[PDB]
Amino acid sequence: MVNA
Amino acid sequence: TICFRPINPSDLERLEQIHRDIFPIRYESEFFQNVVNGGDIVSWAAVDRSRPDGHSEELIGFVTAKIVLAKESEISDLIRYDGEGTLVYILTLGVVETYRKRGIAKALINEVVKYSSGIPVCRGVYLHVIAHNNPAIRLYKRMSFRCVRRLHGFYLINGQHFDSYLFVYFINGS
Numbered sequence: 399m400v401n402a
Numbered sequence: 403t404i405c406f407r408p409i410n411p412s413d414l415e416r417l418e419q420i421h422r423d424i425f426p427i428r429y430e431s432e433f434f435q436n437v438v439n440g441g442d443i444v445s446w447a448a449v450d451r452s453r454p455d456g457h458s459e460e461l462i463g464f465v466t467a468k469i470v471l472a473k474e475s476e477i478s479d480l481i482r483y484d485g486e487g488t489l490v491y492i493l494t495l496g497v498v499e500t501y502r503k504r505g506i507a508k509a510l511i512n513e514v515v516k517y518s519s520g521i522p523v524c525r526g527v528y529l530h531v532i533a534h535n536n537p538a539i540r541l542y543k544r545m546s547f548r549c550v551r552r553l554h555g556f557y558l559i560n561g562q563h564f565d566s567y568l569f570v571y572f573i574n575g576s
């Protein structure tokens with residue numbers, strides 16, 4: 399899951 | 403029988419829905435548009451050809467990734483260099499809940515590792531996973547990704563910070  | 407194919411724009415609404423239902427980090431429309439158009443993001447979809455109701459083409463799993471320059475990544479000091487080295491960064495990975503525990507995620511990661519192996523300049527695959535996501539952490543360890551870093555307070559979710567772990571799979575002798 400890549401950050402925002 | 404689970405089959406695998408590239409993501410295309412007919413998957414757009416399904417892809418967005420699964421993401422907002424299974425990841426606590428929220429993504430913008432342009433991310434999904436970039437995924438489905440191909441371009442700079444590479445992706446694999448998993449589909450169950452036997453689903454009824456005309457959902458036999460609806461994806462039930464996915465992985466998305468992008469190619470980054472190794473020297474400009476956060477793990478540049480970890481890599482052994484040899485063309486300009488690159489890495490494949492897995493952006494998102496998920497399987498629909500009723501399809502879990504069948505090896506679909508393992509197959510999707512294998513598709514990414516197989517792809518990366520086929521690029522001579524590629525030095526590995528890496529990703530971030532939230533702390534305490536035990537199914538994902540076990541999966542990455544099962545496939546010989548190494549945990550090289552704990553990032554304190556990496557994710558902002560509903561006003562609270564959660565740690566992430568950085569997992570790396572080294573390729574082509576890197």
Ligand SMILES: *C(=O)CSCCNC(=O)CCNC(=O)[C@H](O)C(C)(C)COP(=O)(O)OP(=O)(O)OC[C@H]1O[C@@H](n2cnc3c(N)ncnc32)[C@H](O)[C@@H]1OP(=O)(O)O
Binds near residue numbers: 400492
């Ligand atoms: C950023 O996106 C990268 S980190 C975020 C990861 N995604 C996420 O958290 C979203 C929600 N979770 C999931 O989508 C899902 O839980 C995954 C993606 C983490 C894993 O998906 P699968 O469920 O498809 O994973 P598998 O490859 O099935 O392995 C999982 C466990 O089940 C065992 N296994 C595998 N095949 C089996 C068969 N045929 N029969 C029985 N058991 C099977 C594996 O050995 C593994 O072991 P556990 O000890 O984890 O159960």
